[PDB]
UniProtKB/Swiss-Prot annotation:
Similarity section: Belongs to the DNA repair metallo-beta-lactamase (DRMBL) family.
Protein name per UniProt: DNA cross-link repair 1A protein
Residue range from the parent sequence: 700 to 1040 of 1040
Sorted UniProt keywords: Cell cycle, Cell division, DNA damage, DNA repair, Hydrolase, Isopeptide bond, Metal-binding, Mitosis, Nucleus, Phosphoprotein, Ubl conjugation, Zinc, Zinc-finger
Annotated GO MF terms: 5'-3' DNA exonuclease activity; beta-lactamase activity; damaged DNA binding; zinc ion binding
GO cellular component: fibrillar center; nucleoplasm
Effect after changing residue 295 to A: Impaired nuclear focus formation, reduced interaction with PIAS and increased sensitivity to cisplatin
Organism lineage string: Eukaryota, Metazoa, Chordata, Craniata, Vertebrata
GO biological process, any: double-strand break repair via nonhomologous end joining
Signals that turn on the gene: During mitosis. The mRNA encoding this protein contains an internal ribosome entry site (IRES) in its 5'-UTR. This 5'-UTR generally suppresses translation while specifically promoting expression during mitosis, when cap-dependent translation may be impaired.
Tissue specificity note: Expressed in brain, heart, kidney, liver, pancreas, placenta and skeletal muscle.
Keyword Mitochondrion belongs to the record: no
Top-level taxonomic group: Eukaryota
Subunit note: Binds constitutively to TP53BP1. Binds CDC27, which is itself a component of the anaphase promoting complex (APC). Binds PIAS1.
Amino acid sequence: TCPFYKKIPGTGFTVDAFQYGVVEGCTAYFLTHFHSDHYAGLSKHFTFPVYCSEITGNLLKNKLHVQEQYIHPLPLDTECIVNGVKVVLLDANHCPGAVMILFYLPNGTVILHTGDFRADPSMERSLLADQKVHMLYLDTTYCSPEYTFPSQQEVIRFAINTAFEAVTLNPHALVVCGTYSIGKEKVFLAIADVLGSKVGMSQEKYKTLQCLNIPEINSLITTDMCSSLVHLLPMMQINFKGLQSHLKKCGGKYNQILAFRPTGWTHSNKFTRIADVIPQTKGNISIYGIPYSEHSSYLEMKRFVQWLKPQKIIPTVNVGTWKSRSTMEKYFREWKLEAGY
Ligand code: NI
């Protein structure tokens, strides 16, 4: 049944709760972003109101065929009224169109649901600075101190320099980047930009990117693989077998592949720096795993919470085991005692 951490008390609202059938007493279903574990269950047959960002609404209409009359897009950074309750959508610094949601309950309680987010100091100057938040429904994906990772800027710098150097040394090398969802577009777009190429991809993925309101996107992507030297493939295909195969398909236009797999975290982060990453190589194929995260590190998450000083925290990730839940609750108590709220 719908878990309690997907329900907003004092309202008939749910968040990211589309796979439970009809949730008894739900008058409005919010969707934070277009990732499959969150939208799971939506289709052209859904007939309740869905509240979301403009970008998420484009994706619901064009990729899932949800009917327009049930899509309610809201602008960001704007006080809006939904079924008599004041709400605001904030940028979550996750994937395109991802939001956090502030609910102002009739009784005076203020609730923030982060959806999926990568905490950033910029959030400390949004409409969040303007009032107190009593309850926080928190993306705890990486809530343990082993999870450190570099800035997104540092990671894109590494990828751009690596690709530029490789292709300048060998003009017959192909760059391949893996994907399985929206998010992390900067990786492939930054590389294509430094190389003066467009990124080539399947028709389904091209359609997905045309939903995202990215400025000048017609200048950066294409469905013509042959005119492109940065290809996007399914993440499943980013291995030596899948890449040797793909190389055959280009008909000797290329003799070398350099591939990037933008992972979340991998345990080489506990030891190694970004400057010291190395690929796995077989023959003329090299695969780089790069730690490009669209979720908070442990320290980024801790700073956000110690800034916000909520009265109660409700985790939304890693809630399935007692040992995970207990460990997270220990970190929350440390944070509160260190900061004095
Ligand atoms: Ni997500």
